[PDB]
């Protein structure tokens, strides 16, 4: 026996260390159903159609038809041409402290969103506006996962890779928080006020597009903050002790932990709100950056020495990456090899795998 029987000689630079990180697609489970063929993914355990054209057909692009004249269709009604009820003659925003009568159908749907964040996300959260059309968001599975976690746990830490598009889900989450909660102050912190403003900006766009029965009245619409009639608000701040101490956040979102200089100081001021006290919700998303403060935060959470709930999502979350150039499901065998060749294995890991160096 000069050599083994059934190995597989296919090469992948991703399996070039003391481990097999990616399995060849030929080894996957397959099945026929509905006239098409399906492959089960190794990342998901879920079933995908062999032909990319069919994954496309299962994830349609629902366009949102503008409506400003038919209130009965409350799911999309928006009193745009009624200046009396607009926040400063703006078309997409509702004024504050304005009353209206509702049907039982409306109330129940409102309560349905308040308790099912994923429903609210797949049903009313829209993207764009002036180009290609106002459409529903195409939520990815990893995004549903985060909405659910962030929703149920008080403290959350996310270790993500780049290229995933996480700000969309973050924007959706905060839009939900201030929309269904009263008198809650939210604070967005980041390395620079610039990054905070964009997260806030994205959150406003998701709010502007909500239909009137779900959109609260705007009491303030600034570039660095907003406030609603239900007393809730959101402000963009530059991670610093003062920002934290001069406020009473009910929830804090920290984008970039891993790359915040002198995080220990900001961290110090925050634990008061995190620990024994009002116990505000704290959500931190980030991508790994060496063995710094974040390494000992993630570590404490992955083990279970922190109250923080750990969540991780890497390159294989964008499902279109699982289909090769021939438009055939290969579980990302080709998208990783290509991406690597176009750069490096070293670079791939710190960009698509959330590894720590």
Coordinates of C-alpha atoms in Angstrom, one line a residue:
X1 CA 0.0 0.0 0.0
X2 CA 2.1 2.9 -1.3
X3 CA -0.5 5.3 0.1
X4 CA -3.9 5.8 1.6
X5 CA -7.3 5.1 -0.1
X6 CA -9.6 8.0 0.0
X7 CA -8.0 11.3 0.8
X8 CA -8.6 14.2 -1.4
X9 CA -5.7 16.0 -3.1
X10 CA -7.6 19.4 -3.7
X11 CA -5.5 22.2 -2.3
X12 CA -6.7 25.2 -0.3
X13 CA -4.3 27.6 1.4
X14 CA -6.8 27.9 4.2
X15 CA -6.0 24.3 5.2
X16 CA -2.3 24.9 5.1
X17 CA -1.6 24.8 8.8
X18 CA -2.1 22.2 11.6
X19 CA -5.8 22.0 10.7
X20 CA -8.5 21.4 8.1
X21 CA -10.5 24.7 8.2
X22 CA -12.6 24.2 5.1
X23 CA -14.1 21.0 3.7
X24 CA -14.3 20.3 0.0
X25 CA -17.9 20.6 -1.3
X26 CA -17.9 17.1 -2.8
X27 CA -18.0 15.7 0.7
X28 CA -21.2 17.6 1.6
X29 CA -24.7 16.0 2.0
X30 CA -26.9 16.6 -1.1
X31 CA -30.6 16.0 -2.0
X32 CA -33.2 16.5 -4.6
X33 CA -36.4 18.3 -3.8
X34 CA -38.9 20.6 -5.6
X35 CA -37.2 19.7 -8.9
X36 CA -33.9 21.1 -7.8
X37 CA -30.7 19.9 -6.1
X38 CA -29.5 21.1 -2.7
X39 CA -26.3 21.0 -0.8
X40 CA -26.0 21.3 3.0
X41 CA -23.4 23.9 4.2
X42 CA -20.7 23.1 6.7
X43 CA -21.0 26.6 8.3
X44 CA -24.7 26.5 8.7
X45 CA -25.9 23.0 8.6
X46 CA -28.6 24.6 6.3
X47 CA -29.6 23.6 2.8
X48 CA -28.7 25.7 -0.2
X49 CA -29.7 25.3 -3.8
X50 CA -26.9 24.1 -6.1
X51 CA -27.6 26.8 -8.7
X52 CA -27.1 30.5 -7.6
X53 CA -30.0 31.5 -9.8
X54 CA -32.2 29.7 -7.4
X55 CA -30.8 31.2 -4.2
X56 CA -31.6 34.6 -5.9
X57 CA -35.2 33.5 -6.5
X58 CA -35.6 32.6 -2.8
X59 CA -34.4 36.1 -1.8
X60 CA -36.5 38.4 -3.9
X61 CA -36.2 42.2 -3.8
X62 CA -39.5 43.6 -2.5
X63 CA -40.1 47.2 -3.6
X64 CA -42.0 49.5 -1.3
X65 CA -44.8 51.5 -3.0
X66 CA -45.0 55.1 -1.7
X67 CA -48.3 55.9 -0.1
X68 CA -49.6 59.3 1.1
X69 CA -53.3 59.0 0.1
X70 CA -54.7 55.8 1.5
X71 CA -54.7 55.6 5.3
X72 CA -56.5 52.3 5.4
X73 CA -53.2 50.7 4.2
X74 CA -51.7 51.8 7.4
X75 CA -48.7 49.5 6.9
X76 CA -47.4 52.0 4.4
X77 CA -49.4 55.1 5.0
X78 CA -47.4 58.3 5.6
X79 CA -49.2 61.7 5.8
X80 CA -46.6 63.5 3.7
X81 CA -48.8 66.2 2.2
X82 CA -50.2 67.4 5.5
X83 CA -47.8 70.1 6.8
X84 CA -49.8 70.5 10.0
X85 CA -48.6 67.0 11.1
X86 CA -45.0 67.1 9.7
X87 CA -41.9 68.0 11.7
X88 CA -40.9 71.3 10.1
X89 CA -42.4 70.8 6.6
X90 CA -40.3 67.7 6.1
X91 CA -42.0 65.1 4.0
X92 CA -40.8 61.9 5.8
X93 CA -41.0 63.0 9.5
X94 CA -43.9 63.3 11.9
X95 CA -44.4 66.2 14.3
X96 CA -44.6 65.7 18.1
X97 CA -47.4 65.4 20.6
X98 CA -50.0 64.7 17.9
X99 CA -52.9 62.4 18.5
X100 CA -54.8 59.9 16.3
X101 CA -57.3 57.1 16.5
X102 CA -56.3 53.5 15.8
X103 CA -58.0 50.3 14.9
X104 CA -57.5 47.1 16.9
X105 CA -55.6 45.8 13.9
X106 CA -53.2 48.7 14.1
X107 CA -52.6 48.3 17.9
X108 CA -52.0 44.6 17.7
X109 CA -49.5 45.0 14.8
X110 CA -47.8 47.7 16.8
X111 CA -47.5 45.3 19.8
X112 CA -46.3 42.6 17.4
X113 CA -43.3 44.7 16.5
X114 CA -42.6 45.8 20.0
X115 CA -42.1 42.2 20.9
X116 CA -40.8 40.6 17.7
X117 CA -37.8 42.7 16.6
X118 CA -37.1 40.3 13.7
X119 CA -40.6 40.7 12.5
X120 CA -40.3 44.5 12.7
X121 CA -37.0 44.2 10.8
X122 CA -38.2 42.0 7.9
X123 CA -41.4 44.0 7.6
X124 CA -40.8 47.7 8.0
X125 CA -37.1 48.4 8.0
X126 CA -36.3 49.8 4.5
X127 CA -33.1 51.0 2.7
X128 CA -32.2 53.7 0.1
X129 CA -34.6 56.3 -1.2
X130 CA -33.5 58.3 -4.2
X131 CA -31.8 55.6 -6.3
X132 CA -33.0 52.2 -7.3
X133 CA -36.2 52.7 -5.1
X134 CA -37.3 52.4 -1.5
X135 CA -37.0 48.7 -0.7
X136 CA -37.3 46.3 2.2
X137 CA -34.0 45.3 3.8
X138 CA -32.6 41.9 2.8
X139 CA -31.7 40.7 6.3
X140 CA -28.9 38.1 6.6
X141 CA -29.1 35.1 9.0
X142 CA -26.2 36.4 11.1
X143 CA -28.1 39.7 11.4
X144 CA -31.2 38.0 12.7
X145 CA -29.0 36.2 15.3
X146 CA -27.7 39.5 16.5
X147 CA -31.0 41.3 16.7
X148 CA -32.3 38.4 18.8
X149 CA -29.3 38.3 21.1
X150 CA -29.0 42.0 21.6
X151 CA -32.7 42.0 22.2
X152 CA -32.7 39.3 24.9
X153 CA -29.4 39.9 26.8
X154 CA -28.6 43.0 28.7
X155 CA -24.8 42.9 27.9
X156 CA -23.5 41.9 24.4
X157 CA -20.1 41.7 22.8
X158 CA -19.7 41.0 19.1
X159 CA -16.5 39.8 17.4
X160 CA -17.1 40.4 13.7
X161 CA -15.0 40.3 10.6
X162 CA -15.2 43.2 8.1
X163 CA -17.1 43.3 4.9
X164 CA -20.2 41.9 6.7
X165 CA -22.3 45.1 6.8
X166 CA -23.0 45.2 10.5
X167 CA -24.1 48.9 10.8
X168 CA -27.3 48.1 9.0
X169 CA -28.4 45.7 11.8
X170 CA -27.1 48.1 14.5
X171 CA -29.2 50.9 12.9
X172 CA -32.2 48.7 12.9
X173 CA -31.8 47.8 16.6
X174 CA -31.6 51.3 18.0
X175 CA -34.5 52.4 15.8
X176 CA -36.4 49.7 17.5
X177 CA -35.2 50.6 21.0
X178 CA -36.2 54.2 21.0
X179 CA -39.4 53.5 19.0
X180 CA -40.8 51.0 21.5
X181 CA -39.4 52.3 24.8
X182 CA -40.2 55.5 26.7
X183 CA -37.8 58.0 28.3
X184 CA -34.7 56.0 27.4
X185 CA -31.5 57.8 26.6
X186 CA -29.1 56.0 24.3
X187 CA -25.5 57.0 23.7
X188 CA -23.3 55.9 20.8
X189 CA -19.6 56.0 21.5
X190 CA -16.6 55.5 19.2
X191 CA -13.0 56.4 18.6
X192 CA -14.1 59.6 16.9
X193 CA -17.4 61.6 16.8
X194 CA -17.4 61.1 13.1
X195 CA -18.0 57.3 13.3
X196 CA -20.7 57.9 15.9
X197 CA -22.5 60.3 13.7
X198 CA -22.7 57.9 10.8
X199 CA -24.2 55.2 13.1
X200 CA -26.6 57.7 14.3
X201 CA -27.2 58.9 10.7
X202 CA -28.0 55.4 9.5
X203 CA -30.4 55.0 12.4
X204 CA -32.3 58.1 11.4
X205 CA -32.7 56.9 7.8
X206 CA -34.3 53.7 9.1
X207 CA -36.7 55.8 11.2
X208 CA -37.5 58.3 8.5
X209 CA -38.8 55.5 6.4
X210 CA -41.1 53.9 8.9
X211 CA -44.9 54.2 8.3
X212 CA -46.7 56.7 10.5
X213 CA -48.2 54.4 13.0
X214 CA -44.7 53.1 14.0
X215 CA -42.8 56.3 13.7
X216 CA -42.8 58.4 16.9
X217 CA -43.0 62.2 16.7
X218 CA -39.7 64.0 16.3
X219 CA -39.0 66.5 19.0
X220 CA -35.4 67.0 17.6
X221 CA -33.5 66.0 14.5
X222 CA -29.8 67.0 14.9
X223 CA -26.7 65.6 13.3
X224 CA -25.3 64.6 16.7
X225 CA -28.6 63.7 18.4
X226 CA -32.3 63.1 18.2
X227 CA -35.2 63.1 20.7
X228 CA -38.7 61.7 20.4
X229 CA -42.1 62.4 22.0
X230 CA -41.9 59.2 24.1
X231 CA -39.1 60.9 25.9
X232 CA -36.4 58.6 24.4
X233 CA -33.3 60.0 22.6
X234 CA -29.9 59.1 21.0
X235 CA -26.7 61.1 21.0
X236 CA -23.4 60.6 19.2
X237 CA -20.3 61.0 21.5
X238 CA -16.5 60.7 21.3
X239 CA -15.6 57.9 23.8
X240 CA -14.3 59.9 26.8
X241 CA -14.9 60.0 30.5
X242 CA -17.0 63.2 30.4
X243 CA -19.4 61.9 27.8
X244 CA -20.1 59.0 30.1
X245 CA -20.4 60.9 33.4
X246 CA -22.3 63.8 32.1
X247 CA -25.2 61.6 31.1
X248 CA -27.6 58.8 32.3
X249 CA -27.7 56.4 29.4
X250 CA -30.1 53.5 29.6
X251 CA -28.2 51.9 26.8
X252 CA -24.7 52.4 25.4
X253 CA -23.5 51.2 22.0
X254 CA -19.7 51.1 21.5
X255 CA -18.5 50.7 18.0
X256 CA -14.8 49.9 17.7
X257 CA -13.7 48.9 21.3
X258 CA -10.6 47.1 20.0
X259 CA -9.3 50.3 18.4
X260 CA -10.1 52.9 21.1
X261 CA -6.9 54.6 22.6
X262 CA -6.8 54.7 26.4
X263 CA -10.0 52.6 26.5
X264 CA -9.3 52.0 30.2
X265 CA -10.4 55.5 31.2
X266 CA -13.6 55.3 29.2
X267 CA -14.1 51.8 30.5
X268 CA -13.7 53.0 34.1
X269 CA -16.5 55.6 33.8
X270 CA -18.8 53.1 32.2
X271 CA -18.8 50.2 34.7
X272 CA -20.9 52.3 37.0
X273 CA -23.8 52.1 34.6
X274 CA -23.0 48.5 33.7
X275 CA -22.8 47.2 37.3
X276 CA -24.9 47.4 40.4
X277 CA -27.2 50.3 39.8
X278 CA -29.7 51.0 37.0
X279 CA -27.9 48.3 35.0
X280 CA -28.1 49.8 31.5
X281 CA -27.9 47.7 28.4
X282 CA -24.5 47.7 26.8
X283 CA -23.8 46.5 23.3
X284 CA -20.3 46.4 21.8
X285 CA -19.5 45.3 18.2
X286 CA -15.9 45.2 17.0
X287 CA -13.3 43.4 15.0
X288 CA -10.2 41.9 16.7
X289 CA -7.0 44.0 17.0
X290 CA -4.3 42.1 18.8
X291 CA -4.0 41.3 22.5
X292 CA -5.3 44.6 23.9
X293 CA -8.1 45.3 26.4
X294 CA -10.7 43.7 24.0
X295 CA -8.8 40.4 24.1
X296 CA -9.4 40.1 27.8
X297 CA -13.0 41.2 27.4
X298 CA -13.8 38.6 24.6
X299 CA -11.8 36.0 26.6
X300 CA -13.8 36.6 29.8
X301 CA -17.0 36.3 27.8
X302 CA -16.2 33.2 25.7
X303 CA -15.4 31.4 28.9
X304 CA -18.2 32.8 31.0
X305 CA -16.4 35.1 33.6
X306 CA -18.4 38.1 32.3
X307 CA -22.0 38.9 32.2
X308 CA -21.4 39.6 28.5
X309 CA -23.0 37.3 25.9
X310 CA -20.4 36.6 23.1
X311 CA -21.3 36.6 19.4
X312 CA -19.0 36.0 16.4
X313 CA -19.6 36.1 12.7
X314 CA -16.9 35.8 9.9
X315 CA -16.6 35.9 6.1
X316 CA -18.8 32.9 5.5
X317 CA -21.9 34.9 6.6
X318 CA -22.3 36.5 3.2
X319 CA -24.0 33.6 1.4
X320 CA -23.3 34.8 -2.1
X321 CA -19.7 34.0 -1.2
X322 CA -20.7 30.4 -1.1
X323 CA -21.3 30.2 -4.8
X324 CA -18.4 30.0 -7.2
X325 CA -17.8 31.8 -10.6
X326 CA -19.8 29.1 -12.4
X327 CA -22.6 30.2 -10.2
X328 CA -22.5 26.8 -8.4
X329 CA -22.7 26.2 -4.6
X330 CA -19.2 25.3 -3.4
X331 CA -19.5 26.6 0.2
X332 CA -17.0 29.3 -0.5
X333 CA -14.1 27.2 -1.6
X334 CA -13.4 29.5 -4.6
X335 CA -14.3 32.9 -2.9
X336 CA -11.6 32.2 -0.2
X337 CA -9.0 31.0 -2.6
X338 CA -9.6 34.0 -4.9
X339 CA -9.7 36.6 -2.1
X340 CA -6.5 35.2 -0.7
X341 CA -4.6 35.2 -3.9
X342 CA -5.7 38.8 -4.4
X343 CA -3.9 39.5 -1.1
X344 CA -2.4 37.1 1.4
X345 CA -3.3 34.4 4.0
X346 CA -2.0 36.7 6.6
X347 CA -4.3 39.5 5.4
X348 CA -7.3 37.2 4.9
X349 CA -7.3 36.2 8.6
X350 CA -7.3 39.7 10.1
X351 CA -9.9 40.8 7.6
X352 CA -12.3 37.8 7.3
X353 CA -11.8 35.5 10.3
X354 CA -11.8 37.7 13.4
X355 CA -8.7 35.8 14.6
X356 CA -6.4 37.5 17.1
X357 CA -3.2 37.9 15.0

